[PDB]
């Protein structure tokens, strides 16, 4: 840096557009020794950059992906260089306007620290630190990295302002979808021959409600099966997502049955109406912030019972389609409806069959039915072993990791939902004029030492 | 529960109250078998479990009975011609029998609409089978981390 | 303890049963390790390290 022939420009980038600070982040292995000296060099270079160049700061220079050294440390999953840039307080008094941690007032036992929200909550900027902590970083250390000092209180800021509001809208917006469906059911003409001529304007009004009700069940049906291939118990616990799925299944079954021409659709249509008002009993809990261990369990409960239903129904269709292929003489095209009807009744145990006479081939019907019990009894035990093989070893760690992660994940999805006008309204942090003014955040402390 | 059900049935006018009345008498002398333990002072781990066992089975009964009343009251509303006021007693009687599996029904003929009766009964199993697993996951999601 | 013991053991058990399945001709093809001429040459294996001490 200081020489007599030619000096070294600290601001110089590379072919990757990275400066001297970004290489220190890229070698910052989270160990004992390596987290020590990188904090020594990071303080040494920036003070030397200000002393040689008072106009520009070395942190301001971005990359080919427009990344600061603080923005880069969230990507590669670095902690020691991360916790030092956040806790940055410089004694040199010339590189002071870029310091991060401050001391407001020190009335005895109570210290008043002050952290800047410079890049943590970018209101009207491109991309934030906190967004890369949630949306982009795939490193395991993101559970520890959210447990740094300001972000544990920064996430509690916007949770207290947006959590109670966004939950109450979700309760009302579900009640709107129910009162629409009540007006559909009790105002049906009910002749016995569905569908109907949709020419009456006062019947055209309730016709619009089928667009609202059905497509809401369709969006919930096709996104979750895509989310399976590719349980937010904060608001509503994970038992609701399975029950609202069963509500979503019965709607699209209902929509088929009055388009086939069979007038017995009316039983299923009012059946899901009873569940939807009784699904509102999960709204009475309120809001949950303390993580239990059953939260990770109910994802696998939803993961495999949906697999348990599809392995059922494909087997019932497949074995019915199998038995039609045995019929070499003509057989009739209406036999497959009669195979599948006489096959569902055996699993329940109705005994109201039409084709299969168990008195005809008794020694074969039993040994297929006994093995059908053994197939189903093991698939039930695959549920319990997958739960018992989960609640033992590392559930003591991960259930307090994803619960912290999903609590941070949802509140930023709420933050993306508001427009740019309402974004500036409930913004945390205050303007505190320090130096020779910024949007920093007030943090309290209590300490009995340092006298 | 069986006492207040008994008190209704001889005020309705139906003389079959006598079966339920002596039924709870058999339990009450057999409930005295929990008196033989003595007194417990050493804490086990099942004590916090049996609160949630009592918390949700009472919820499991009310989510049952409101669903049985609600679906029976639903099917009366399908009847646009006159229907009769005594049909709701016959819907609810023929609806409890299906969950047990008596098959002694009076109105619902499964031979009439078989492809609809099965797919409602199959989904009725799936509704009840998940609510049973909500008991076991709430117990397994309790006896691991901080129950010690 | 044991679920992270037999899982390590069975992971090593199966890959040697796969190794017994190939003939002697295909055995020499995907052989790990390199010839590095050391001394006054052998089939050794390269291992990387990272250390900030030892200066
Ligand atoms: Ba039976």
mmCIF file of C-alpha atoms in Angstrom, chain A residues 7 11 153 164 270 279 385 412 429 432-433 449:
data_model
loop_
_atom_site.group_PDB
_atom_site.id
_atom_site.type_symbol
_atom_site.label_atom_id
_atom_site.label_comp_id
_atom_site.label_asym_id
_atom_site.label_seq_id
_atom_site.Cartn_x
_atom_site.Cartn_y
_atom_site.Cartn_z
ATOM 1 C CA UNK A 7 1.453 1.570 -4.875
ATOM 2 C CA UNK A 11 -10.223 -0.890 -5.056
ATOM 3 C CA UNK A 153 -35.039 -8.723 16.964
ATOM 4 C CA UNK A 164 -51.877 -10.207 13.684
ATOM 5 C CA UNK A 270 -73.750 -30.396 1.243
ATOM 6 C CA UNK A 279 -62.850 -26.507 9.644
ATOM 7 C CA UNK A 385 -41.995 -46.677 11.896
ATOM 8 C CA UNK A 412 -40.954 -12.340 4.221
ATOM 9 C CA UNK A 429 -36.202 1.473 12.603
ATOM 10 C CA UNK A 432 -31.095 8.907 14.397
ATOM 11 C CA UNK A 433 -28.777 11.712 13.272
ATOM 12 C CA UNK A 449 -19.955 -5.247 34.270
#
